[PDB]
Amino acid sequence: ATFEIVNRCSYTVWAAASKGDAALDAGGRQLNSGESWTINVEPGTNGGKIWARTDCYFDDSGSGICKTGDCGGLLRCKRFGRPPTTLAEFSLNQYGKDYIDISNIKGFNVPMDFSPTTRGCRGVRCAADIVGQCPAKLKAPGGGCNDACTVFQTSEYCCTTGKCGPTEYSRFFKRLCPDAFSYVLDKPTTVTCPGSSNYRVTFCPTA
């Protein structure tokens, strides 16, 4: 599958793509405002994620740090990033179908649209000003709005027992972005697409 990753933000982001134990394609790249990066993701990829990283500093060797979404200090991510990270999530060619979603379960840093570029399904978007409206106890100094599990590490926020309900914090994310997952047992906002669809992820789709 082809993913086009587009930075429509007025600021530079460092895109990342990983399935947790390996990079997808190159794994990461700098995207200045307006730049597009096309990657190829192997069919059958399960549990892939794409996210943006902000305020990064990398040396010649691709080693450094980012204030949001850092993946062990690497430009080319092999593992998932540090919250807060708005997440585009996908599993491809699962018994004939692709499944896509946006998640705020690991917080929010950059607004995002995740849409097919081929026919057969709709896209999803979370583009509200979650950072500006973020509850004080979830605000991340480096930027972004943490999820409650990251901040408080309780069974209820992290849904550790497989039982949990919505919370004051999850409802905040859900109010501003109804089409994104707000906690682990949220009613699924997953979209089913034809197997082997292609996609575009746009950072800052409205601004």
XYZ file of all heavy atoms in Angstrom, residues 28-134:
809
model
N 11.129 7.431 9.241
C 10.925 8.815 9.624
C 11.609 9.765 8.681
O 12.545 9.387 7.972
N 11.131 11.002 8.662
C 11.676 12.015 7.778
C 11.227 13.389 8.217
O 10.123 13.552 8.734
C 11.219 11.774 6.338
C 12.250 12.122 5.309
C 11.564 12.369 4.002
N 11.121 13.752 3.885
C 10.636 14.267 2.762
N 10.508 13.493 1.696
N 10.277 15.544 2.704
N 12.070 14.380 7.981
C 11.673 15.767 8.162
C 10.707 16.202 7.064
O 10.950 15.940 5.884
C 12.903 16.676 8.153
C 12.568 18.141 8.372
C 13.806 18.994 8.516
O 14.821 18.541 9.033
N 13.733 20.231 8.049
N 9.630 16.878 7.451
C 8.696 17.480 6.505
C 8.555 18.950 6.814
O 7.915 19.322 7.806
C 7.308 16.832 6.557
C 7.121 15.404 6.079
C 5.669 14.990 6.256
C 7.523 15.295 4.638
N 9.129 19.798 5.964
C 8.866 21.211 6.105
C 7.424 21.499 5.712
O 6.735 20.645 5.137
C 9.841 22.025 5.256
C 11.267 21.874 5.728
O 11.522 21.767 6.928
N 12.203 21.851 4.791
N 6.956 22.695 6.042
C 5.601 23.093 5.699
C 5.327 22.937 4.208
O 5.998 23.558 3.376
C 5.363 24.542 6.122
O 4.061 24.962 5.757
N 4.334 22.115 3.884
C 3.926 21.866 2.518
C 4.498 20.614 1.893
O 4.024 20.191 0.835
N 5.518 20.025 2.515
C 6.185 18.862 1.915
C 5.352 17.584 2.045
O 4.562 17.415 2.988
C 7.567 18.628 2.534
C 8.579 19.701 2.111
C 10.005 19.386 2.521
O 10.225 18.739 3.566
O 10.934 19.791 1.783
N 5.555 16.694 1.085
C 4.875 15.412 1.011
C 5.891 14.289 0.936
O 6.897 14.392 0.221
C 3.960 15.341 -0.221
O 3.002 16.385 -0.236
N 5.609 13.210 1.651
C 6.480 12.050 1.707
C 5.671 10.818 1.369
O 4.687 10.534 2.037
C 7.089 11.936 3.101
C 7.987 10.776 3.355
C 8.862 10.187 2.486
C 8.107 10.068 4.592
N 9.521 9.151 3.118
C 9.080 9.065 4.412
C 7.487 10.193 5.840
C 9.439 8.181 5.433
C 7.848 9.316 6.857
C 8.811 8.320 6.643
N 6.076 10.090 0.332
C 5.350 8.903 -0.081
C 6.083 7.658 0.403
O 7.272 7.477 0.123
C 5.189 8.867 -1.611
O 4.446 10.019 -2.033
C 4.460 7.616 -2.042
N 5.389 6.815 1.157
C 5.996 5.584 1.627
C 5.230 4.371 1.152
O 4.046 4.454 0.803
C 6.098 5.527 3.171
C 4.722 5.515 3.840
C 6.933 6.681 3.675
C 4.800 5.217 5.341
N 5.900 3.226 1.159
C 5.259 1.982 0.772
C 5.230 0.995 1.923
O 6.272 0.615 2.455
C 5.965 1.377 -0.437
C 5.745 2.189 -1.689
O 4.699 2.085 -2.330
N 6.718 3.022 -2.035
N 4.022 0.592 2.301
C 3.801 -0.272 3.448
C 3.400 -1.648 2.921
O 2.502 -1.765 2.083
C 2.721 0.309 4.374
C 2.398 -0.664 5.491
C 3.182 1.649 4.949
N 4.078 -2.683 3.400
C 3.845 -4.035 2.907
C 2.418 -4.497 3.186
O 1.893 -4.264 4.272
C 4.848 -5.002 3.540
C 6.277 -4.802 3.059
C 6.498 -5.348 1.663
O 5.926 -6.413 1.350
O 7.237 -4.715 0.878
N 1.780 -5.143 2.197
C 0.458 -5.728 2.431
C 0.490 -6.665 3.632
O 1.512 -7.315 3.887
C 0.174 -6.509 1.141
C 1.013 -5.862 0.112
C 2.238 -5.333 0.810
N -0.608 -6.717 4.372
C -0.687 -7.589 5.529
C -0.128 -6.980 6.799
O -0.156 -7.624 7.849
N 0.376 -5.750 6.717
C 0.922 -5.088 7.893
C -0.158 -4.904 8.948
O -1.204 -4.318 8.690
C 1.540 -3.718 7.541
O 2.719 -3.929 6.756
C 1.923 -2.955 8.805
N 0.102 -5.426 10.138
C -0.848 -5.335 11.224
C -0.313 -4.406 12.306
O 0.844 -4.528 12.710
C -1.131 -6.725 11.794
C -2.016 -6.675 13.002
O -3.239 -6.614 12.882
N -1.408 -6.691 14.184
N -1.126 -3.450 12.743
C -0.734 -2.604 13.852
C 0.292 -1.546 13.489
O 1.167 -1.207 14.297
N 0.189 -1.016 12.276
C 1.044 0.089 11.881
C 0.529 1.404 12.435
O -0.673 1.574 12.655
N 1.441 2.343 12.666
C 1.075 3.677 13.119
C 1.914 4.731 12.420
O 3.098 4.523 12.154
C 1.247 3.816 14.637
C 0.447 2.800 15.453
C 0.511 3.110 16.933
C 0.070 1.924 17.779
N -1.299 1.461 17.473
N 1.285 5.869 12.146
C 1.973 7.053 11.634
C 1.679 8.201 12.593
O 0.542 8.350 13.062
C 1.502 7.395 10.202
C 2.077 6.366 9.219
C 1.903 8.820 9.793
C 1.362 6.308 7.872
N 2.694 9.004 12.893
C 2.497 10.161 13.753
C 3.485 11.255 13.376
O 4.427 11.029 12.591
C 2.626 9.778 15.241
C 3.989 9.355 15.720
C 4.866 10.111 16.447
C 4.610 8.063 15.562
N 5.989 9.379 16.750
C 5.864 8.123 16.210
C 4.231 6.869 14.931
C 6.745 7.046 16.234
C 5.119 5.792 14.946
C 6.354 5.887 15.606
N 3.247 12.441 13.919
C 4.165 13.562 13.777
C 4.939 13.764 15.068
O 4.425 13.524 16.161
C 3.406 14.840 13.413
N 6.175 14.224 14.924
C 7.007 14.647 16.037
C 7.298 16.125 15.896
O 7.491 16.612 14.783
C 8.310 13.858 16.058
C 8.077 12.372 16.219
C 9.361 11.617 15.964
N 9.665 11.565 14.529
C 10.796 11.063 14.034
N 11.749 10.638 14.866
N 10.988 11.000 12.720
N 7.328 16.839 17.013
C 7.588 18.272 16.973
C 8.861 18.642 17.721
O 9.284 17.946 18.646
C 6.417 19.081 17.562
O 6.200 18.701 18.931
C 5.139 18.843 16.758
N 9.454 19.752 17.290
C 10.628 20.352 17.925
C 11.750 19.341 18.120
O 12.200 19.072 19.243
C 10.240 21.006 19.252
C 9.422 22.262 19.050
O 9.851 23.126 18.255
O 8.348 22.381 19.671
N 12.213 18.807 16.998
C 13.288 17.831 16.989
C 14.633 18.445 16.664
O 14.731 19.420 15.904
C 13.036 16.734 15.952
S 11.503 15.830 16.108
N 15.683 17.825 17.196
C 17.070 18.171 16.880
C 17.866 16.892 16.629
O 18.047 16.086 17.543
C 17.702 18.991 18.012
C 17.007 20.313 18.229
C 15.888 20.399 19.043
C 17.446 21.473 17.589
C 15.232 21.596 19.231
C 16.791 22.682 17.777
C 15.684 22.730 18.598
O 15.016 23.912 18.791
N 18.337 16.706 15.396
C 19.068 15.502 15.024
C 20.453 15.854 14.520
O 20.627 16.852 13.827
C 18.314 14.715 13.952
C 17.023 14.125 14.434
C 15.807 14.608 13.985
C 17.030 13.077 15.338
C 14.618 14.052 14.438
C 15.846 12.525 15.798
C 14.638 13.014 15.348
N 21.436 15.037 14.872
C 22.780 15.247 14.355
C 22.936 14.566 12.998
O 21.957 14.100 12.408
C 23.847 14.750 15.346
C 23.776 13.250 15.613
O 23.269 12.481 14.769
O 24.251 12.832 16.691
N 24.167 14.521 12.504
C 24.449 13.934 11.198
C 24.040 12.465 11.128
O 23.619 11.982 10.077
C 25.937 14.072 10.865
C 26.386 15.518 10.790
O 25.571 16.414 11.096
O 27.559 15.759 10.434
N 24.155 11.763 12.251
C 23.941 10.318 12.269
C 22.472 9.937 12.462
O 22.138 8.754 12.524
C 24.785 9.667 13.370
O 24.281 9.979 14.659
N 21.597 10.933 12.566
C 20.177 10.671 12.723
C 19.796 10.393 14.166
O 18.792 9.736 14.443
N 20.607 10.909 15.083
C 20.393 10.733 16.514
C 20.067 12.075 17.158
O 20.677 13.091 16.824
C 21.637 10.114 17.161
O 21.482 9.983 18.560
N 19.106 12.091 18.075
C 18.737 13.332 18.715
C 17.583 13.238 19.683
O 17.493 12.291 20.469
N 16.703 14.227 19.619
C 15.555 14.261 20.502
C 14.425 15.057 19.863
O 14.664 15.901 18.999
C 15.930 14.872 21.868
C 14.850 14.570 22.896
C 16.174 16.384 21.759
C 15.304 14.780 24.274
N 13.197 14.755 20.271
C 12.014 15.539 19.907
C 11.206 15.811 21.167
O 11.204 14.987 22.091
C 11.120 14.797 18.913
S 11.914 14.307 17.381
N 10.483 16.927 21.194
C 9.657 17.245 22.360
C 8.352 16.460 22.428
O 7.821 16.244 23.518
C 9.353 18.735 22.413
C 10.578 19.540 22.728
C 10.229 20.918 23.192
C 11.496 21.686 23.502
N 11.198 23.103 23.816
N 7.814 16.051 21.282
C 6.694 15.115 21.291
C 6.992 13.982 20.336
O 7.611 14.180 19.282
C 5.341 15.765 20.905
O 5.358 16.213 19.542
C 5.026 16.938 21.816
N 6.565 12.782 20.712
C 6.646 11.638 19.824
C 8.007 11.019 19.617
O 8.175 10.229 18.703
N 8.972 11.350 20.467
C 10.329 10.837 20.297
C 10.333 9.307 20.320
O 9.690 8.698 21.178
C 11.246 11.386 21.393
C 12.692 11.031 21.165
O 13.299 11.573 20.220
O 13.215 10.196 21.926
N 11.038 8.694 19.375
C 11.145 7.237 19.327
C 12.577 6.797 19.644
O 13.348 6.432 18.752
C 10.708 6.706 17.956
S 11.734 7.308 16.575
N 12.948 6.876 20.916
C 14.273 6.458 21.330
C 15.401 7.272 20.720
O 16.505 6.764 20.518
N 15.123 8.532 20.399
C 16.165 9.431 19.942
C 16.585 9.267 18.492
O 17.607 9.815 18.085
N 15.809 8.531 17.705
C 16.176 8.280 16.308
C 15.336 9.074 15.322
O 14.143 9.268 15.525
C 16.039 6.797 15.969
C 16.889 5.804 16.766
C 16.593 4.382 16.318
C 18.367 6.115 16.611
N 15.960 9.500 14.231
C 15.219 10.113 13.141
C 14.345 9.058 12.474
O 13.160 9.277 12.222
C 16.177 10.739 12.118
C 15.536 11.214 10.813
C 14.531 12.319 11.083
C 16.607 11.679 9.836
N 14.934 7.896 12.213
C 14.234 6.811 11.533
C 13.666 5.808 12.538
O 14.348 4.865 12.940
C 15.182 6.123 10.548
C 15.666 7.050 9.434
C 16.925 6.529 8.747
N 18.105 6.622 9.603
C 18.917 7.675 9.650
N 18.682 8.735 8.891
N 19.967 7.668 10.461
N 12.411 6.016 12.934
C 11.796 5.247 14.021
C 11.647 3.766 13.747
O 11.144 3.377 12.695
C 10.415 5.814 14.348
S 10.460 7.476 15.012
N 12.071 2.952 14.710
C 11.840 1.517 14.671
C 10.787 1.125 15.691
O 10.172 0.064 15.590
C 13.142 0.745 14.929
C 14.217 1.001 13.890
C 15.390 0.041 14.047
C 16.041 0.154 15.419
N 17.201 -0.780 15.546
N 10.580 1.981 16.683
C 9.589 1.712 17.717
C 8.629 2.887 17.831
O 8.846 3.940 17.228
C 10.268 1.443 19.062
C 10.872 2.673 19.715
C 11.758 2.292 20.897
N 11.913 3.389 21.849
C 12.877 3.458 22.760
N 13.790 2.499 22.835
N 12.938 4.490 23.591
N 7.564 2.704 18.605
C 6.550 3.741 18.756
C 7.073 4.931 19.567
O 8.073 4.836 20.287
C 5.290 3.167 19.403
C 4.569 2.173 18.543
C 4.012 1.032 19.104
C 4.424 2.382 17.181
C 3.337 0.108 18.315
C 3.751 1.461 16.390
C 3.204 0.330 16.960
N 6.385 6.055 19.444
C 6.857 7.295 20.022
C 6.294 7.616 21.389
O 5.254 7.110 21.789
N 6.992 8.508 22.072
C 6.621 8.991 23.388
C 5.372 9.868 23.315
O 5.313 10.775 22.492
C 7.801 9.780 23.958
C 7.749 10.079 25.422
C 9.098 10.636 25.852
N 9.215 10.764 27.297
C 8.722 11.781 27.994
N 8.054 12.749 27.380
N 8.877 11.822 29.306
N 4.364 9.608 24.163
C 3.221 10.534 24.191
C 3.656 11.941 24.597
O 4.654 12.089 25.287
C 2.287 9.920 25.247
C 2.677 8.497 25.309
C 4.156 8.437 25.027
N 2.909 12.971 24.196
C 1.632 12.894 23.487
C 1.780 12.807 21.975
O 2.569 13.560 21.375
C 0.938 14.202 23.891
C 2.064 15.160 24.104
C 3.232 14.349 24.611
N 1.012 11.909 21.367
C 1.040 11.701 19.924
C -0.340 11.403 19.385
O -0.910 10.371 19.721
C 1.926 10.498 19.519
O 1.506 9.340 20.243
C 3.397 10.758 19.782
N -0.865 12.265 18.523
C -2.043 11.897 17.733
C -1.643 10.733 16.834
O -0.595 10.794 16.216
C -2.532 13.064 16.880
O -2.446 14.265 17.651
C -3.973 12.839 16.421
N -2.434 9.661 16.786
C -2.035 8.473 16.027
C -2.951 8.130 14.867
O -4.168 8.031 15.047
C -1.973 7.248 16.956
C -0.903 7.311 18.045
C -1.093 6.195 19.063
C 0.486 7.244 17.419
N -2.364 7.933 13.687
C -3.051 7.269 12.585
C -2.717 5.783 12.684
O -1.551 5.427 12.682
C -2.609 7.842 11.235
N -3.729 4.925 12.806
C -3.507 3.498 13.035
C -4.124 2.680 11.933
O -5.220 2.995 11.465
C -4.114 3.067 14.373
C -3.668 3.932 15.534
C -4.208 3.446 16.854
O -5.445 3.259 16.979
O -3.395 3.261 17.779
N -3.449 1.608 11.531
C -3.976 0.804 10.440
C -3.536 -0.645 10.505
O -2.437 -0.961 10.972
C -3.563 1.409 9.089
C -2.107 1.760 9.003
C -1.182 0.853 8.513
C -1.660 3.004 9.418
C 0.170 1.196 8.429
C -0.320 3.342 9.355
C 0.594 2.438 8.858
N -4.421 -1.522 10.043
C -4.080 -2.910 9.789
C -4.567 -3.234 8.393
O -5.731 -2.996 8.070
C -4.713 -3.839 10.823
O -4.162 -3.591 12.106
N -3.678 -3.777 7.568
C -3.962 -3.935 6.148
C -4.178 -5.386 5.766
O -3.515 -6.266 6.295
C -2.813 -3.359 5.318
C -2.362 -1.947 5.696
C -1.207 -1.511 4.793
C -3.528 -0.973 5.596
N -5.096 -5.616 4.833
C -5.331 -6.953 4.276
C -5.624 -7.974 5.357
O -5.004 -9.041 5.419
C -4.128 -7.416 3.447
C -3.691 -6.382 2.438
O -2.746 -5.642 2.679
N -4.386 -6.320 1.301
N -6.569 -7.628 6.216
C -7.005 -8.534 7.263
C -8.285 -9.200 6.804
O -9.361 -8.607 6.878
C -7.209 -7.782 8.572
C -5.966 -7.020 9.007
C -4.827 -7.943 9.388
O -4.955 -8.752 10.309
N -3.703 -7.831 8.681
N -8.144 -10.427 6.308
C -9.256 -11.180 5.744
C -10.029 -10.351 4.726
O -11.255 -10.284 4.758
C -10.178 -11.685 6.856
C -9.449 -12.538 7.867
C -9.072 -12.017 9.096
C -9.129 -13.862 7.587
C -8.406 -12.791 10.027
C -8.459 -14.648 8.513
C -8.099 -14.103 9.733
O -7.438 -14.870 10.669
N -9.288 -9.708 3.828
C -9.881 -9.022 2.692
C -10.181 -7.547 2.891
O -10.621 -6.871 1.961
N -9.943 -7.039 4.097
C -10.283 -5.651 4.407
C -9.117 -4.909 5.043
O -8.235 -5.520 5.649
C -11.499 -5.596 5.341
C -12.793 -6.184 4.754
C -13.280 -5.368 3.565
C -14.597 -5.905 3.010
N -15.004 -5.146 1.790
N -9.112 -3.587 4.890
C -8.213 -2.710 5.637
C -8.995 -2.045 6.756
O -10.164 -1.712 6.576
C -7.632 -1.592 4.767
C -6.644 -2.062 3.705
O -6.292 -3.257 3.605
O -6.209 -1.167 2.947
N -8.346 -1.800 7.887
C -8.993 -1.110 8.995
C -8.174 0.091 9.407
O -6.983 -0.044 9.699
C -9.174 -2.053 10.184
C -10.084 -3.212 9.884
C -9.576 -4.427 9.439
C -11.456 -3.084 10.014
C -10.414 -5.490 9.155
C -12.304 -4.140 9.732
C -11.778 -5.339 9.303
O -12.623 -6.391 9.031
N -8.796 1.264 9.440
C -8.062 2.484 9.794
C -8.779 3.250 10.897
O -10.000 3.161 11.038
C -7.840 3.423 8.567
C -9.159 4.020 8.061
C -7.091 2.683 7.445
C -8.989 5.138 7.034
N -8.017 3.989 11.697
C -8.616 4.855 12.703
C -7.634 5.941 13.099
O -6.436 5.875 12.779
C -9.053 4.055 13.948
C -7.877 3.493 14.724
O -7.276 4.246 15.513
O -7.552 2.297 14.563
N -8.156 6.960 13.771
C -7.318 7.908 14.488
C -7.566 7.697 15.973
O -8.697 7.419 16.398
C -7.617 9.355 14.084
C -7.151 9.598 12.643
C -6.928 10.357 15.031
C -7.504 10.983 12.147
N -6.501 7.799 16.757
C -6.582 7.569 18.188
C -5.962 8.707 18.981
O -4.882 9.201 18.622
C -5.877 6.264 18.540
O -5.843 6.101 19.941
N -6.652 9.103 20.053
C -6.128 9.990 21.088
C -5.796 9.244 22.385
O -5.635 9.864 23.435
C -7.131 11.112 21.399
C -7.226 12.128 20.280
O -6.215 12.510 19.688
N -8.438 12.573 19.986
N -5.691 7.918 22.320
C -5.429 7.126 23.524
C -4.043 7.423 24.107
O -3.839 7.306 25.331
C -5.597 5.614 23.218
C -7.080 5.321 22.971
C -5.066 4.740 24.343
C -7.344 3.923 22.442
N -3.114 7.846 23.243
C -1.780 8.280 23.671
C -1.626 9.794 23.579
O -0.512 10.315 23.404
C -0.694 7.594 22.830
C -0.660 6.081 22.993
C -0.135 5.707 24.371
C 0.039 4.204 24.547
N 0.461 3.876 25.947
N -2.740 10.503 23.731
C -2.713 11.954 23.711
C -2.765 12.559 22.318
O -3.002 11.878 21.321
N -2.547 13.863 22.270
C -2.690 14.637 21.040
C -1.543 15.624 20.951
O -1.242 16.302 21.928
C -4.048 15.361 21.052
C -4.299 16.271 19.869
C -5.132 15.865 18.835
C -3.749 17.542 19.816
C -5.405 16.699 17.764
C -4.004 18.391 18.743
C -4.838 17.972 17.711
N -0.913 15.726 19.784
C 0.076 16.787 19.589
C -0.214 17.633 18.359
O -0.139 18.856 18.440
C 1.523 16.229 19.563
C 1.803 15.234 18.431
O 0.905 14.614 17.854
N 3.087 15.067 18.129
N -0.599 16.999 17.253
C -0.820 17.683 15.982
C -2.159 17.232 15.411
O -2.483 16.046 15.470
C 0.348 17.364 14.987
C 0.145 17.962 13.593
C 1.678 17.834 15.568
N -2.948 18.164 14.852
C -4.206 17.760 14.206
C -3.937 16.930 12.947
O -2.906 17.096 12.286
C -4.884 19.091 13.885
C -3.765 20.096 13.849
C -2.726 19.617 14.807
N -4.895 16.081 12.591
C -4.661 15.058 11.583
C -5.918 14.682 10.800
O -7.009 14.600 11.375
C -4.086 13.814 12.274
C -3.898 12.621 11.379
S -3.406 11.148 12.290
C -1.699 11.519 12.661
N -5.764 14.459 9.493
C -6.790 13.828 8.685
C -6.178 12.537 8.140
O -5.017 12.523 7.724
C -7.229 14.744 7.540
C -8.275 14.109 6.658
O -7.906 13.339 5.752
O -9.473 14.362 6.879
N -6.948 11.457 8.137
C -6.496 10.163 7.637
C -7.562 9.668 6.670
O -8.644 9.265 7.096
C -6.287 9.209 8.825
C -5.678 7.861 8.494
C -5.157 7.547 7.249
C -5.622 6.893 9.494
C -4.599 6.288 7.012
C -5.067 5.644 9.269
C -4.551 5.331 8.028
N -7.277 9.740 5.370
C -8.274 9.428 4.346
C -7.746 8.474 3.283
O -6.573 8.511 2.937
C -8.749 10.711 3.653
O -9.518 11.518 4.528
N -8.622 7.620 2.745
C -8.239 6.839 1.563
C -8.069 7.734 0.331
O -8.744 8.763 0.221
C -9.422 5.881 1.386
C -10.583 6.659 1.933
C -10.031 7.414 3.121
N -7.166 7.355 -0.568
C -7.025 8.033 -1.862
C -7.619 7.183 -2.971
O -7.630 7.583 -4.135
C -5.559 8.329 -2.202
O -4.807 7.110 -2.153
C -4.977 9.347 -1.227
N -8.102 6.003 -2.589
C -8.813 5.107 -3.492
C -10.269 5.009 -3.026
O -10.610 5.503 -1.955
C -8.151 3.720 -3.533
O -7.964 3.246 -2.196
C -6.792 3.801 -4.207
N -11.133 4.384 -3.817
C -12.560 4.429 -3.512
C -12.983 3.338 -2.533
O -12.264 2.357 -2.334
C -13.376 4.324 -4.801
C -12.742 5.059 -5.972
C -13.778 5.507 -6.983
N -13.383 5.182 -8.350
C -14.019 5.613 -9.434
N -15.081 6.399 -9.311
N -13.592 5.265 -10.643
N -14.141 3.522 -1.905
C -14.739 2.456 -1.121
C -14.952 2.688 0.364
O -15.538 1.847 1.037
N -14.479 3.816 0.883
C -14.664 4.135 2.297
C -14.392 5.612 2.547
O -13.906 6.322 1.661
C -13.748 3.276 3.171
S -12.021 3.358 2.659
N -14.696 6.064 3.757
C -14.533 7.462 4.120
C -13.290 7.646 4.974
O -12.710 6.678 5.463
C -15.758 7.965 4.883
C -15.908 7.349 6.267
C -17.016 8.024 7.058
N -17.136 7.481 8.410
C -16.477 7.953 9.466
N -15.646 8.981 9.331
N -16.647 7.396 10.659
N -12.879 8.890 5.156
C -11.766 9.182 6.035
C -12.222 9.623 7.410
O -13.422 9.753 7.680
N -11.260 9.834 8.295
C -11.547 10.336 9.634
C -10.605 11.489 9.939
O -9.525 11.593 9.350
C -11.407 9.247 10.713
C -12.607 8.292 10.674
C -10.106 8.495 10.541
N -11.009 12.348 10.861
C -10.249 13.547 11.143
C -10.352 13.916 12.615
O -11.403 13.756 13.228
C -10.760 14.695 10.262
C -10.102 16.037 10.492
C -10.666 17.087 9.533
N -10.356 16.762 8.144
C -10.508 17.607 7.131
N -10.966 18.834 7.354
N -10.196 17.234 5.898
N -9.255 14.405 13.174
C -9.291 15.084 14.460
C -8.520 16.386 14.314
O -7.285 16.375 14.305
C -8.686 14.228 15.572
S -8.628 15.076 17.178
N -9.233 17.501 14.197
C -8.574 18.763 13.852
C -8.940 19.912 14.776
O -8.642 21.069 14.492
C -8.882 19.144 12.411
N -9.545 19.585 15.901
C -9.899 20.575 16.907
C -8.657 21.060 17.642
O -7.618 20.398 17.617
C -10.900 19.982 17.885
N -8.769 22.202 18.317
C -7.650 22.758 19.072
C -7.542 22.106 20.447
O -7.800 22.731 21.481
C -7.796 24.273 19.218
C -6.575 24.921 19.836
O -5.528 24.251 19.959
O -6.660 26.112 20.192
N -7.149 20.840 20.450
C -7.060 20.099 21.691
C -5.929 20.630 22.565
O -6.057 20.672 23.788
C -6.904 18.588 21.398
C -8.276 18.035 20.970
C -6.344 17.825 22.610
C -8.303 16.574 20.623
N -4.831 21.083 21.966
C -3.756 21.600 22.807
C -4.181 22.895 23.525
O -3.919 23.067 24.723
C -2.468 21.839 22.002
C -1.400 22.430 22.900
C -1.981 20.528 21.405
N -4.850 23.798 22.812
C -5.287 25.047 23.416
C -6.307 24.851 24.526
O -6.333 25.599 25.512
N -7.155 23.842 24.371
C -8.241 23.618 25.331
C -7.886 22.590 26.410
O -8.679 22.340 27.318
C -9.511 23.156 24.604
C -10.051 24.116 23.550
C -10.557 25.428 24.116
O -10.527 25.667 25.319
N -11.024 26.296 23.232
N -6.699 22.003 26.300
C -6.261 20.904 27.165
C -6.426 21.231 28.655
O -5.995 22.294 29.104
C -4.796 20.585 26.852
S -4.149 19.111 27.660
